[PDB]
């Protein structure tokens, strides 16, 4: 029927894969952020009246 079970992505990976009962994808990901932030790059303790 045209419903939730029909439109949700559900490819039959279990039949095209040689090894049974292990996760389909193993992934390594790396996130390289350049950040400008409202804080110093290293904070030294001190400066009581300041900020």
């Amino acid at each position: 029927a045209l419903n939730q079970e029909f439109i949700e992505e559900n490819p039959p990976m279990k039949r095209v894969l040689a090894v049974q009962d292990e996760p389909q994808f193993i992934m390594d990901a790396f996130f390289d952020l350049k950040c400008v932030r409202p804080m110093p790059v290293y904070s030294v303790p001190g400066l009581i009246d300041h900020f």
Binding site: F30, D32, V41, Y42
Partner: protein
């Protein structure tokens, strides 16, 4: 075959570097007089700082 992804090890190392101390150097004259009596052949310590 695939290409390897980087490690974060270099950015983690950089966050651990402490900043240099700000020293506040200055130049001034440290003149001093010293007066004494001594005899020949001895090593006399006339200046100490």
């Amino acid at each position: 075959f695939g290409r390897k992804v980087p490690s974060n090890a270099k950015s983690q190392h950089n966050f651990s570097v402490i900043p240099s101390a700000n020293i506040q150097r200055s130049v001034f004259n440290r003149s001093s007089g010293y007066k004494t009596t001594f005899d020949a052949g001895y090593l006399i310590p006339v200046f100490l700082d």
